[PDB]
């Protein structure tokens, strides 16, 4: 397992949360060693407290991501709705308590994620700042 993601999973367990969703390319590179500029496209790292983590990227990034990342990586092409695709590829969307990076995630992305996850969202930025 990824040592830094082991620390996130402990944090989630200590907070009684089931899922962290990272969106900031800088945090994602900190955690995984993959750096992305997604432009207008979607980029998320889903760190379940128990399941394998999942990287979600534009299709054009899959090959590069896969060179550095051994856990699941899924892409979406431009003709696909990214929110429907996340729903289609993730093992589980039932988390009751979710952490996300409120200092990076824009309101449109936040609302997008809320069409998939009905759980309560909490701010991850205190954890991120403290690494
Ligand atoms: Cl891992």
TrEMBL record:
The lineage of its organism: Bacteria, Bacillati, Bacillota, Bacilli, Lactobacillales. Keywords: Dipeptidase, Hydrolase, Manganese, Metal-binding, Protease. Coiled coil: none annotated. This is XAA-PRO dipeptidase X-PRO dipeptidase. Residues 5-131 form the Creatinase N-terminal domain. GO terms for molecular function: metal ion binding; proline dipeptidase activity. The chain holds residues 3 to 130 of 361 of the full protein. Belongs to the peptidase M24B family. The keyword Manganese applies.
């Amino acid at each position: 397992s990824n040592a830094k993601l082991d620390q996130i999973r402990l944090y989630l367990d200590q907070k009684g949360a089931e899922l962290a969703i990272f969106s900031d390319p800088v945090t994602i590179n900190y955690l995984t060693g993959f750096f992305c500029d997604p432009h207008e496209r979607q980029l998320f790292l889903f760190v379940y407290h128990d399941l394998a983590p999942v990287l979600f990227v534009p299709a054009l990034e899959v090959a590069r991501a896969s060179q550095a990342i051994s856990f699941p990586v899924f892409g979406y092409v431009d003709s696909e709705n990214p929110w429907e695709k996340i729903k289609a590829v993730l093992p589980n969307t039932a988390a009751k308590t979710i952490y996300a990076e409120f200092d990076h995630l824009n309101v449109n992305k936040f609302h997008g994620l809320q069409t998939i996850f009905s759980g309560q969202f909490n701010n991850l930025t205190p954890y991120v700042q403290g690494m």
